[PDB]
Amino acid sequence: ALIENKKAKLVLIANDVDPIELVVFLPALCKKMGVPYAIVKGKARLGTLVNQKTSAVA
Amino acid sequence: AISKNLPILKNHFRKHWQERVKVHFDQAGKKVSRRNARATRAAKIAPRPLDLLRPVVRAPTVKYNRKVRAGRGFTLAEVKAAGLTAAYARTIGIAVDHRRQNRNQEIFDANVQRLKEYQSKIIVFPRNGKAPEAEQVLSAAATFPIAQPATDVEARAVQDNGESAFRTLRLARSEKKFRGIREKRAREKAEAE
Amino acid sequence: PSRFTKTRKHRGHVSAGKGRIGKHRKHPGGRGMAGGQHHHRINMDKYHPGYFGKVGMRYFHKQQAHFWKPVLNLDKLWTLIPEDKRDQYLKSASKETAPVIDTLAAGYGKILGKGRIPNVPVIVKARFVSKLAEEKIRAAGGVVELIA
Amino acid sequence: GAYKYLEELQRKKQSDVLRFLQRVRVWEYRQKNVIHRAARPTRPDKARRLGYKAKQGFVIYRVRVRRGNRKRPVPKGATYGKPTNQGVNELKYQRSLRATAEERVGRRAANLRVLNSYWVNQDSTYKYFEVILVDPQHKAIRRDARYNWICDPVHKHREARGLTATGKKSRGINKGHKFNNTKAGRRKTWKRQNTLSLWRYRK
Amino acid sequence: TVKTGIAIGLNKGKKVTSMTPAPKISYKKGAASNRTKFVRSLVREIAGLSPYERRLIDLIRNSGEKRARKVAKKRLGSFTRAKAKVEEMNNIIAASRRH
Amino acid sequence: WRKWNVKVNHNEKRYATASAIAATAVASLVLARGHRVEKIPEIPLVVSTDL
RNA sequence: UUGACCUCAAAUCAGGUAGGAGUACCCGCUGAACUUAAGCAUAUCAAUAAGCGGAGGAAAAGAAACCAACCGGGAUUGCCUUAGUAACGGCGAGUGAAGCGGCAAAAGCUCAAAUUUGAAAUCUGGUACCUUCGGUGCCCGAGUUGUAAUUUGGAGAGGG
RNA sequence: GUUCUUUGUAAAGUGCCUUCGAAGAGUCGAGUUGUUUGGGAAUGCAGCUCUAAGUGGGUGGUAAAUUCCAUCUAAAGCUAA
């Protein structure tokens, strides 16, 4: 929703989603709207940034 | 097998029909049980008449379009027309039909005045008030009978025009029948340049 | 009741009214409708001509309400008018007062000209009418009003 | 908003992107038991559409079932009757393949109550389904009147009796004319239509 | 819907003062929308076209339009889906040809 | 399934009830039934409503 | 090196639950043949008996991806009726519904798909106390691959 | 019917204007086979193969092409008598 409303300026994406379909569009939304994204290694490291176990996005 | 001068008969008894045989020997027994549960509910809901105000509705299927009959619910246009909300009307013994739609004003206003007459003749009691006893009656359908609308006046003039009203029926069917070819012939005739 | 049937009178008599040579048996000629185009032909032909074959065309999903058109004959046309409310109309062939007979309210879809109405003018409201029916009403002085 | 992209791609099964996903996924399923726990719904837009919630007490199980006809279990094709009952091979099993896939989990996880199920993958041999379970014994479902109905004892083994979406379809339970012979149940119609009624004052 | 007042004919029936009641919202359930059009757009972009979908562009380019539907008539279930599925592909051709 | 109850025309039940009502005022018939009405003043026997 | 995530295990780990019996009446699944056709093979018995799975006090069905073609009706169930009819059928033997009308009973509805993003607000479980079909304090966990709040097409949501 | 707590700086209903209004997929649907039906150029069901859509789709009991019209909202769910 943030990407659709142009309310994002940097997206962090985990590459380790076991179902990949949750994210295959995320690099695709970010370009067509114009948001820059970073596919970064690790949910467990995007997790502690959120104080969770996995986030798959940030 | 076949024999003296008798009609043919189709008697369907070649299955084990002897176990699926009902003889309601309970006809009188069920009747009394109905009349207890009819009153036992009437005590539990004491003031209310055991039924919802049902509307007046013109039947389908041209065989029966000629009479009018109780319907299922009050066609949200009706409950909003008489100035009341459906969620509350369902608490006032009004049956409301969320899926029926009004299409005839004479039928339409009949339900409005039916519902207006209902509002005058009912007494709604406060959730915290004294709630005085009000001598229930056991039927809204009895208190507001479904009366067939009056169609014509018993005396009128004679207006003869010579059309004989039979040629009208003969002409009509020829119009429903032959319309297609002369309307298709209309196109191909207009196709000339 | 059992005490009146001839079974009470067939006690003591061996065959019980079934014969000694015939010897009443289970189903000597086949059960049901066997032998129609076979040993029972003469019976079927003499009493049931038309029992085999087909005659016309089929019709799927029939409901008998499209052909619903109960008939009222022109002989009566008056049992619909109330009994005590009749005789003052038959004696007074008055114009601009003639009765309206709504056959549908009676339950009749068609009117046919069975015969000999009184010559008083009357207004009839009919879905359908017969040809000879319509002028016989009109020759009396009335008119038929098509209704739907 | 994520499910809306999940919904639409998951219907693009014959695109080069899912044909890779489809082909890879079927291999690991075939590499595991015929019926087993799935770690999570591989189709979250599908599971949650089918009543699933990511709450303690919803259970995931993947199933695979054998495909094709039902060969009649007669020794050497011996039917012992009339010619019309001589077929042995072209027999098609009126109950569906997911309907027979739910029953084995219900037998397996008997203390659970099946909610619904859906297709995940397939191959020539095995048709694949995920089955959504729910536990009436868990307090996170006993409360929350959204999901307290499944706790009622009339809802044991809903699939074996055929009360799921699989069975209600196989049983032909839908409104209108194309479902006359089975509208409230084919047997109940037959018994009602093949009963003769007699009153005290016989008509 | 103007009844003629007679049980037969073109507009058979008794004339009654109609009302034209309020629109039923469950008629545009299958009508497209803003969220619908956008997501449907991007899915086609990130998924591509099907093996049978590609054979649709291949045949429409080479040997004409009539048989494009005929192969679409069998490959799709109904014929009404075949005409639509062809026009979905002509839009792809127009989009690619512009670029 | 035997036929226990027998349906009787409504008009006949009304016919027969009127006959058995008209037969209550015949002392010849009432004596034939053995009702010991030899000492009754007259029939029909009507008493005041206070009964 | 250490700490996580995913996935998969183990335990006489804490708490549970399925089984078996009965099974007239219900929901499925499998499925005959005797018989009728004056033989008999499609047909009929019969979508039945036998066999298997699964419940309740009733079950099941149930609030239209319905019925109709009317001046439209309005969940489902059951009765009477439609009707031994439309239709099927070695068009033979035979089979065989439903809409319409009156009555019993009548009751409606809710989820998915929407950022709370100015704040995981949610839920299990553990422990102490208390007024225990439970409430409160505290603590891990589930939970961002979505648990609470908000709305269900008959609508409704964001603003004035 | 009697009484104690005020739940709540909360919730519901209601008129006019504006912008939207997401509504379910190995599913619908089609062919073929089998079985099933009263369902007829195919009533349901199931097997295989194919497998969509958004003024769309399902139905409208004679197959097909073209033009209209009516009525509902499936692939999700609860519910007494």
UniProtKB/Swiss-Prot annotation, chain A:
Transmembrane regions: none
Entry superkingdom: Eukaryota
Location of this chain's protein in the cell: Cytoplasm
Miscellaneous section: Present with 238000 molecules/cell in log phase SD medium. There are 2 genes for eL8 in yeast.
Role description: Component of the ribosome, a large ribonucleoprotein complex responsible for the synthesis of proteins in the cell. The small ribosomal subunit (SSU) binds messenger RNAs (mRNAs) and translates the encoded message by selecting cognate aminoacyl-transfer RNA (tRNA) molecules. The large subunit (LSU) contains the ribosomal catalytic site termed the peptidyl transferase center (PTC), which catalyzes the formation of peptide bonds, thereby polymerizing the amino acids delivered by tRNAs into a polypeptide chain.
Family of this protein: Belongs to the eukaryotic ribosomal protein eL8 family.
Quaternary structure (record): Component of the large ribosomal subunit (LSU). Mature yeast ribosomes consist of a small (40S) and a large (60S) subunit. The 40S small subunit contains 1 molecule of ribosomal RNA (18S rRNA) and 33 different proteins (encoded by 57 genes). The large 60S subunit contains 3 rRNA molecules (25S, 5.8S and 5S rRNA) and 46 different proteins (encoded by 81 genes).
Listed name of the protein: Large ribosomal subunit protein eL8A
Residues of the full protein shown: 141 to 198 of 256
From Swiss-Prot, chain C:
Organism: Saccharomyces cerevisiae (strain ATCC 204508 / S288c) (Baker's yeast)
Gene Ontology molecular function, alphabetical: RNA binding; structural constituent of ribosome
Keywords per UniProt: Cytoplasm, Isopeptide bond, Ribonucleoprotein, Ribosomal protein, Ubl conjugation
UniProt superkingdom: Eukaryota
Crosslinked positions (Glycyl lysine isopeptide (Lys-Gly) (interchain with G-Cter in ubiquitin)): K95
Cell compartment(s), UniProt: Cytoplasm
GN (gene name): RPL28
Function statement: Component of the ribosome, a large ribonucleoprotein complex responsible for the synthesis of proteins in the cell. The small ribosomal subunit (SSU) binds messenger RNAs (mRNAs) and translates the encoded message by selecting cognate aminoacyl-transfer RNA (tRNA) molecules. The large subunit (LSU) contains the ribosomal catalytic site termed the peptidyl transferase center (PTC), which catalyzes the formation of peptide bonds, thereby polymerizing the amino acids delivered by tRNAs into a polypeptide chain.
Subunit structure: Component of the large ribosomal subunit (LSU). Mature yeast ribosomes consist of a small (40S) and a large (60S) subunit. The 40S small subunit contains 1 molecule of ribosomal RNA (18S rRNA) and 33 different proteins (encoded by 57 genes). The large 60S subunit contains 3 rRNA molecules (25S, 5.8S and 5S rRNA) and 46 different proteins (encoded by 81 genes).
GO biological processes: cytoplasmic translation
Ranges annotated as biased composition (Basic residues): 1-13, 20-29
Keyword ATP-binding attached: no
Region of interest (Disordered), residue spans: 1-38
GO cellular component: cytoplasm; cytosol; cytosolic large ribosomal subunit; nucleus
One family name in Pfam for this protein: Ribosomal_L27A
UniProt protein name: Large ribosomal subunit protein uL15
UniProtKB/Swiss-Prot annotation, chain D:
Biased composition (Basic residues): 168-184
Molecular function GO terms recorded: RNA binding; structural constituent of ribosome
Chief subcellular location: cytoplasm
Domain of life per record: Eukaryota
Keywords in alphabetical order: Cytoplasm, Ribonucleoprotein, Ribosomal protein
Ribosomal protein in keyword set: yes
Region (Disordered): 163-184
UniProt-listed PROSITE patterns: RIBOSOMAL_L15E
Ribonucleoprotein found in the keyword field: yes
Subcellular location: Cytoplasm
Alphabetical list of InterPro entries matching this protein: Rbsml_eL15_core_dom_sf, Ribosomal_eL15, Ribosomal_eL15_CS, Ribosomal_uL23/eL15/eS24_sf
Record-level GO cellular component terms: cytosol; cytosolic large ribosomal subunit
Any GO BP annotation: cytoplasmic translation
Pfam families: Ribosomal_L15e (PF00827)
Gene3D superfamilies linked: Ribosomal protein l15e
SUPFAM superfamilies named in the record: Ribosomal proteins S24e, L23 and L15e
Function, in words: Component of the ribosome, a large ribonucleoprotein complex responsible for the synthesis of proteins in the cell. The small ribosomal subunit (SSU) binds messenger RNAs (mRNAs) and translates the encoded message by selecting cognate aminoacyl-transfer RNA (tRNA) molecules. The large subunit (LSU) contains the ribosomal catalytic site termed the peptidyl transferase center (PTC), which catalyzes the formation of peptide bonds, thereby polymerizing the amino acids delivered by tRNAs into a polypeptide chain.
Family: Belongs to the eukaryotic ribosomal protein eL15 family.
Other remarks in the entry: There are 2 genes for eL15 in yeast.
Protein name: Large ribosomal subunit protein eL15A
Curated annotation (Swiss-Prot), chain E:
InterPro entries: Ribosomal_eL36, Ribosomal_eL36_sf
Gene Ontology CC entries for this record: cytosol; cytosolic large ribosomal subunit
Posttranslational modification: N-terminally acetylated by acetyltransferase NatA.
Top-level taxon of the source organism: Eukaryota
Keyword Hydrolase: no
Subcellular location: Cytoplasm
Residues bearing PTM N-acetylthreonine: T1
UniProt KW keywords: Acetylation, Cytoplasm, Ribonucleoprotein, Ribosomal protein
Pfam families: Ribosomal_L36e
Note: Present with 31600 molecules/cell in log phase SD medium.
Subunit and partners: Component of the large ribosomal subunit (LSU). Mature yeast ribosomes consist of a small (40S) and a large (60S) subunit. The 40S small subunit contains 1 molecule of ribosomal RNA (18S rRNA) and 33 different proteins (encoded by 57 genes). The large 60S subunit contains 3 rRNA molecules (25S, 5.8S and 5S rRNA) and 46 different proteins (encoded by 81 genes).
Role this protein plays: Component of the ribosome, a large ribonucleoprotein complex responsible for the synthesis of proteins in the cell. The small ribosomal subunit (SSU) binds messenger RNAs (mRNAs) and translates the encoded message by selecting cognate aminoacyl-transfer RNA (tRNA) molecules. The large subunit (LSU) contains the ribosomal catalytic site termed the peptidyl transferase center (PTC), which catalyzes the formation of peptide bonds, thereby polymerizing the amino acids delivered by tRNAs into a polypeptide chain.
PANTHER family: 60S RIBOSOMAL PROTEIN L36
Listed name of the protein: Large ribosomal subunit protein eL36A
Gene name in the database record: RPL36A
